[PDB]
């Protein structure tokens, strides 16, 4: 009947084409702002559409019952869910769930909707050991911090004669009014912020008449606090992330002290642990969603197979002549090679765009390319001759040539879009069939749309979807709430008041930068609703990312001279001789240190330094004489290891020599490199590099050629368009009421004080846009080059504040494929190179010397067994039931409550909160101790020796002993010693570990591996040792911009390490760089006198500046990724010997 | 950077001579104005005078004793100062005694004019004949100490490695 008849629609395909195009009407609708015209109408339009889809959806399966099982299945369920929302609203993000259909209707998506949420089911066994793991961080770390980012730097009232601010006379009544004020305090100019100050004997000063004080306003916003739980762990987790974490570090060592970097290197260190740990959760998820598709699909072809089996039982003679002359030349390899050859020549002649290129130049490339146009096309029409043009259609890489042939000649026409003559050099490509490793590149960035291209729409979905949440729920509150945001209410750089700018908050919070979006977010949106979107946006997003850089790898798969020699060989070999070296290379190293400014304070240690490296010189020249007569010119030079201390010592000749340049302080700077040759640990993390190395050139080769392009094509768009017209005394760019040109930005110079400042990391040149380009891959200083980037109008126009924002897209462009692509090949060639290494090259394993070796198999027994029976019964009118007191499970789980309750007990410990709170937490405290103590004790007397035995138990005595000196230590009180002792309280929360088990695996893990984690930070310390005292003696005194403030300067050894360190993890690494790069006046004083020491001048310099971070980062990033594999090597190897 | 470093007070007769004073503003950062006064206490008795007065040009003060002989070597230009140190030319005996700067400053913050001052205190003590000033000498003399010392391991050892294998040579 009538009901029959809804089932022929509802089968149809021609009516879900319908359903297919209300979703990309409706997808794309809901992106931009209102319009009047399409009226709500539209609104009323995509309603009933979903209503009609759902009505037959329905009015098919059957009445109330029928409609029922309809519900079993859950994609149906969901429509339901929108579908009810959006009608129910005739009397919003559930408007925006209407994209969600977008997933339902597409039967190849639920198989992924399917993946991603049966691989969450996995995972909640690791979100327990980390968001445990967190907490216990934080109540360490909010014991040791409560209040300290609160710090303000407030004024000391004027005791002057007159009563002009008369305190000295009265300063009772206003005193907590008083320090609140932001015009008393102090801030720095362009700060949002006043200026965190800790009066600890070390940390961050504040000029004088102004004190250190607590109370103000807090970080940022106020989402920065310490004090408070959630706060601090927000920070800590931050920290896990790395998610602009270096503000954090930086205004954590100014508040609390210099000295507090031990907390922040047990924090980022773990913080990275538990990341891994995540990882390797999916790892062994994603093999089992990929064992699955060998399991049955190989069983679907024997399904197929077996039952298939079973059914089966002048000028025409010329127009092939001269065609034949064309195609003659075709096939013989002397046209092939040629045309790799003009490839890579026209790549080179493209590249030399230096900016001002005067007529010279101008003409040069201008009608050098014009030249290769002959070359590509005559390569075209000589090859539609030859192959039938549909046959040489069909080869894509001829169908791809085709394309640009056309591309080519549209720029003779045009005579903004000359990015359209860099689309040549996507035919090096081309090259790749040659070649060894770019093909794989081009094989994975294929396989992201061929095979695995349905995972890239739920990553183009999932994406998208957050953008038209944050632009329904917030893009009305920018509008009305800007004004906290900003000084004049327009409108930030990143704002959910458009659906564009809302896209990149989404991209740039998948990036793992989402604070500074946050910050933002939550004032003028809300504390609640800011803050469910962002923790989302990571933990859908992050999850989606992960399987997609998973599992683009897992588819990319004389008698007395003669006796003479012996005894120099011979006292080599001993010990004694051996180890005095190295404790004078330890030695000559540690005065080494000791360089830098504060050398001209004091007196003795310059005269200690300047006579004892003569020794520490003649101790080598020894050495480097004994190593001689033992080894011999031959097998002396031959050593690897032994060429340096030819080489660092023969540079100690050449210094004592020119008393009878200064180039060879560098190379004493040096010197504490040959401790890589001495400690045994060390050299198999130099051996194991090295055997990377020579493949990471080719994974490197690839990359500087594939980024080469986006070079290229980046100094046509931008070059010399980022000079900016600035006035000095604001460091406000000129609005552009006034300055359109340069050559009238000049006139205003002349009558005034204003300059045409360029920017200083940029696209001027092919290389210089090649560093401009590492920054935006690293996302440290991105910023700022992209907002130059975005405001560039023309060779010589100043930019006004934002045009053409549509060239964000030429960064999100590049990030995914000269970032994400580019990396996932780079891990996808070490992951393997350790496959080869390991087997077939590998003795056992890696990282470890011989000892090594046997100590973690010393801890394999550890874990595996050890098992005691029932034990001291021990029956006695004196101690009888006592053995039920320990061994019952009456017990156990209840003492699990005692901590679970005093683990709350420390996270209402928040800052400001009174005594009588205060006096409670203090009575709780002394309970808590007296209930575990009391308990130890009973455990002590009922099992006298036995007990001692379990290493739990020795534990609890370990923690409980600690505890009862946490109270007398408190009864004898130096603020600093104090909280540390509040430390000692956080051990009782590490008591629940037994109780887990499933933390307790993988954490053993750390145990299991931490010696092989111990070298690979033993070359790391050394690596940063070397870069110090490099630093030193350089970058000292540059003028401090930037991310060298007061603190965070190459100034000694002691502001070094810090500084390093919060760029091993490549944080930051643009904020050292500026000041570095920046050279004479202005910005220069050179001449300059620093007050006490012997050098003039603050300049930087740029040759010294650049290689120093960026042959950094190359070593701070092969050194981890090393790390990341003796890690994961180990817990990877535990799930094999586990399941079988 | 910035570090005050206390200067010398052991000097040589017939000679030019250098207290340099520095006062480092606890935050060598924000825009100042100052002033050095030098004052001296001589081994005559306890009173003491201008000697040296400085803004942005020579301030030069009458002590005929010390006077037609001053020079600043101290800080120049900026008047924002930190170091102060003038020098004393052709210094005799007459000299000994001891120093007391002044910087006063009147650090203009940028929000509120404000002022302090500081105290740096110099006994000049004049030796003929300047000598090396006995960490020189001492550091001199204990290098020679190792260096013999060693010379003598390598040679101690030589010989008793040497005796202690031919001895195993003739088995051989
Ligand atoms: C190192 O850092 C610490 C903090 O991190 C600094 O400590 C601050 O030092 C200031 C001066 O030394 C302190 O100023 C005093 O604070 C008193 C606080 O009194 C408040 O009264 C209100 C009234 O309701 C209460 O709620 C508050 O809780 C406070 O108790 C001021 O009253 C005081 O003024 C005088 O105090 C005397 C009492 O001795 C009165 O009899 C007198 O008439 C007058 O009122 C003065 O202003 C400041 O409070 C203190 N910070 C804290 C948090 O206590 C160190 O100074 C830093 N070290 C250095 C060298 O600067
Ligand atoms: C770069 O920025 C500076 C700082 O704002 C600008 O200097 C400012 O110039 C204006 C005049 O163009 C001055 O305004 C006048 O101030 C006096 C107060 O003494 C007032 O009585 C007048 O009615 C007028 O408002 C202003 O004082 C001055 N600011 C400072 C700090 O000196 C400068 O104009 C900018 N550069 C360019 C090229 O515009
Ligand atoms: C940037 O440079 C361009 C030229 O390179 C400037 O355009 C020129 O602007 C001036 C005044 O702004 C114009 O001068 C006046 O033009 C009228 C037109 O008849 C004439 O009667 C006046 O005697 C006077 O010459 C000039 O014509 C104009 N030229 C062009 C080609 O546009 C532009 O103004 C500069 N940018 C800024 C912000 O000033
Ligand atoms: C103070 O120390 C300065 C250098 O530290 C000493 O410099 C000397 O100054 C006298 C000034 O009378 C020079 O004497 C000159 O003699 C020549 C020839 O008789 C005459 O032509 C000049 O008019 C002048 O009188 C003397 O050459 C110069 N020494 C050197 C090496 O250039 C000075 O000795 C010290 N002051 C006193 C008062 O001794
Ligand atoms: C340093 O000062 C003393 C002042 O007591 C000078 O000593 C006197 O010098 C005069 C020469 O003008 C002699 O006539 C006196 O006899 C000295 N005093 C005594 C107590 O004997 C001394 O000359 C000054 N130094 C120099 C280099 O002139």
Redesign the pocket.
């Known amino acids: 009947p009538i009901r029959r008849g809804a089932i022929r629609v509802f089968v149809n395909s021609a009516f879900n084409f319908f359903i297919m195009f209300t979703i990309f009407s409706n997808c794309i609708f809901m992106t931009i702002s209102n319009p009047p015209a399409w009226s709500k109408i539209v609104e009323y339009t995509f309603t009933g559409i979903y209503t009609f889809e759902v009505i037959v959806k329905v009015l098919s399966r059957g009445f109330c019952i029928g409609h029922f099982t309809f519900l079993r299945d859950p994609w149906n369920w969901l429509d339901f869910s929108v579908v009810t929302m959006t009608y129910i609203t005739e009397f919003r993000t559930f408007r925006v769930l209407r994209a969600l259909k977008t997933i339902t209707i597409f039967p190849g998506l639920k198989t992924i909707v399917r993946a991603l949420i049966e691989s969450m089911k996995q995972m909640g066994d690791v979100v327990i050991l980390t968001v445990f793991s967190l907490a216990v961080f934080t109540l360490a770390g909010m014991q040791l911090f409560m209040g300290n980012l609160r710090?303000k730097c407030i004024r000391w009232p004027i005791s002057n004669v007159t009563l002009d601010y008369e305190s000295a006379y009265n300063?009772?009544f206003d005193?907590?009014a008083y320090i609140e004020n932001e015009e008393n305090q102090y801030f720095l100019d362009g700060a949002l912020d006043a200026l965190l100050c800790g009066?600890n004997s070390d940390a961050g000063k504040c000029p004088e008449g102004y004190?250190?004080?607590?109370?103000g306003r807090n970080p940022n916003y106020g989402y920065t606090n310490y004090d408070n739980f959630a706060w601090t762990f927000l920070c800590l987790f931050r920290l896990m992330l790395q998610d602009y974490w270096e503000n954090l570090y930086q205004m954590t060592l100014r508040a609390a002290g210099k000295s507090y970097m031990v907390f922040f290197i047990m924090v980022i260190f773990l913080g990275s642990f538990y990341l891994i740990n995540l990882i390797l959760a999916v790892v062994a998820m994603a093999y089992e969603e990929q064992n699955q598709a060998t399991l049955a699909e190989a069983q679907e072809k024997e399904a197929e197979f077996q039952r298939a089996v079973e059914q089966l039982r002048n000028c025409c003679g010329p127009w092939v002549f001269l065609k034949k002359w064309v195609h003659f030349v075709m096939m013989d390899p002397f046209t092939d090679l040629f045309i790799t050859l003009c490839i890579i020549l026209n790549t080179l002649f493209m590249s030399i765009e230096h900016h001002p290129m005067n007529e010279s130049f101008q003409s040069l490339l201008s009608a050098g390319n014009l030249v290769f146009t002959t070359i590509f096309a005559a390569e075209m029409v000589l090859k539609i001759i030859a192959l039938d043009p549909y046959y040489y259609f069909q080869q894509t890489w001829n169908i791809f040539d085709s394309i640009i042939v056309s591309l080519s000649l549209l720029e003779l026409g045009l005579s903004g879009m000359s990015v359209l003559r860099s689309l040549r050099l996507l035919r090096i490509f081309k090259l790749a069939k040659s070649w060894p490793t770019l093909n794989i590149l081009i094989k994975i960035i294929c396989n992201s749309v061929g095979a695995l291209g349905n995972l890239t729409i739920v990553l183009a979905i999932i994406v998208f979807i957050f953008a038209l949440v944050g632009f329904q729920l917030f893009g009305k509150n920018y509008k009305e709430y800007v004004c906290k945001i900003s000084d004049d209410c327009e409108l930030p750089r990143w704002h959910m008041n458009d659906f564009f700018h809302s896209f990149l908050i989404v991209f740039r919070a998948l990036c793992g930068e989402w604070i500074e979006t946050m910050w933002d977010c939550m004032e003028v949106g809300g504390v609640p609703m800011c803050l469910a979107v962002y923790m989302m946006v990571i933990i859908i997003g992050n999850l989606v990312m992960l399987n997609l850089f998973l599992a683009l790898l897992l588819s990319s798969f004389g008698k007395i001279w003669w006796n003479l020699r012996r005894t120099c060989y011979t006292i080599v070999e001993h010990d004694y001789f051996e180890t005095f070296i190295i404790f004078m290379i330890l030695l000559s190293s540690g005065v080494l240190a000791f360089e830098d400014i504060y050398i001209w304070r004091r007196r003795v240690i310059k005269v200690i330094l300047e006579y004892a490296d003569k020794v520490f010189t003649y101790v080598f020249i020894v050495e480097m004489l004994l190593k001689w007569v033992a080894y011999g010119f031959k097998r002396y030079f031959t050593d690897a290891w032994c060429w340096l201390d030819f080489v660092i010592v023969g540079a100690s000749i050449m210094g004592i020599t020119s008393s009878l340049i200064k180039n060879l302080r560098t190379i004493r700077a040096l010197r504490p490199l040959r401790a890589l040759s001495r400690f045994e640990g060390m050299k198999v993390v130099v051996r194991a590099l090295l055997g990377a190395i020579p493949s990471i050139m080719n994974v490197l080769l690839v990359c500087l050629m594939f980024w080469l392009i986006f070079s290229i094509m980046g100094v046509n768009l931008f070059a010399g368009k980022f000079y900016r017209c600035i006035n000095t005394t604001t460091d406000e760019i000129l609005p552009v009421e006034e300055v359109n040109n340069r050559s009238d930005c000049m006139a205003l110079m002349y009558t005034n004080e204003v300059r045409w400042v360029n920017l200083k990391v940029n696209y001027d040149n092919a290389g210089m846009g090649y560093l401009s380009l590492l920054q935006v891959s690293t996302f440290k200083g991105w910023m700022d080059i992209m907002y130059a980037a975005v405001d560039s109008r023309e060779v010589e126009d100043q930019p006004i504040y934002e045009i053409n924002v549509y060239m964000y897209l030429y960064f999100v462009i590049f990030i995914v494929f000269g970032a994400f692509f580019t990396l996932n090949l780079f891990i996808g060639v070490i992951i393997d190179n350790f496959n080869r290494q390991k087997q077939k090259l590998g003795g056992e394993d890696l990282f470890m010397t011989e000892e090594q070796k046997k100590y973690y198999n010393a801890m394999k027994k550890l874990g595996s067994k050890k098992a005691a029976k029932c034990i001291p019964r021990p029956s006695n009118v004196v101690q009888g039931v006592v053995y039920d007191i320990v061994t019952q499970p009456f017990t156990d789980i209840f003492i699990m409550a005692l901590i679970c309750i005093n683990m709350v007990a420390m996270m209402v410990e928040s800052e400001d909160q009174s005594q009588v709170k205060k006096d409670i937490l203090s009575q709780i405290n002394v309970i808590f101790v007296i209930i575990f103590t009391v308990e130890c004790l009973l455990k002590l007397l009922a099992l006298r020796q036995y007990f001692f035995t379990v290493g739990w138990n020795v534990f609890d005595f370990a923690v409980v002993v600690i505890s009862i000196i946490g109270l007398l230590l408190s009864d004898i009180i130096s603020p600093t010693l104090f909280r540390v002792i509040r430390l000692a309280r956080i051990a009782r929360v590490l008591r629940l570990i037994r109780a887990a088990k499933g933390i307790r695996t993988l954490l053993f893990a750390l145990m299991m591996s931490l010696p092989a984690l111990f070298n690979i930070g033993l070359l790391l310390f050394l690596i940063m040792f070397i870069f110090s005292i490099f630093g030193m003696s350089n970058f000292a005194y540059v003028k401090k911009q930037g991310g060298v403030d007061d603190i965070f300067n190459f100034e000694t050894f002691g502001n070094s390490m810090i500084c390093l360190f919060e760029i091993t993890t490549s944080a930051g690494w643009d904020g050292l760089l500026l000041p570095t790069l920046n050279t004479g006046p202005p910005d220069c004083d050179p001449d300059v006198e620093n007050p006490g020491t012997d050098v003039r001048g603050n300049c930087g310099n740029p040759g010294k500046g650049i290689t120093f971070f960026c042959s950094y980062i190359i070593l701070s990033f092969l050194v981890v990724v090393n790390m990341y594999i003796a890690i994961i090597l180990e817990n990877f190897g535990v799930a094999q010997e586990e399941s079988s | 950077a910035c570090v005050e470093v206390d200067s010398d007070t052991e000097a040589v007769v017939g000679h030019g001579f250098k207290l340099g004073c520095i006062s480092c503003k606890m935050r060598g950062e924000v825009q100042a104005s100052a002033t050095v006064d030098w004052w001296f206490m001589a081994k005559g008795e306890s009173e003491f005078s201008h000697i040296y007065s400085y803004i942005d040009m020579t301030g030069m003060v009458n002590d005929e004793r010390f006077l037609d002989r001053l020079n600043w070597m101290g800080s120049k230009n900026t008047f924002d100062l930190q170091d102060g140190s003038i020098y004393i030319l052709n210094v005799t005996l007459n000299d000994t005694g001891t120093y007391r700067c002044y910087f006063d400053r009147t650090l203009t913050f940028n929000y509120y004019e404000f002022r302090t001052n500081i105290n740096k205190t110099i006994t000049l003590n004049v030796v003929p004949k300047a000598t090396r000033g006995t960490a020189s000498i001492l550091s001199e003399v204990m290098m020679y100490v190792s260096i013999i010392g060693l010379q003598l391991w390598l040679l101690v050892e030589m010989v008793y490695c040497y005796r202690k294998i031919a001895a195993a040579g003739e088995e051989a």
Do not use: D, E
């Open positions: 710090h300063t009772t005193f907590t009066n004190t250190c004080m607590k109370a």
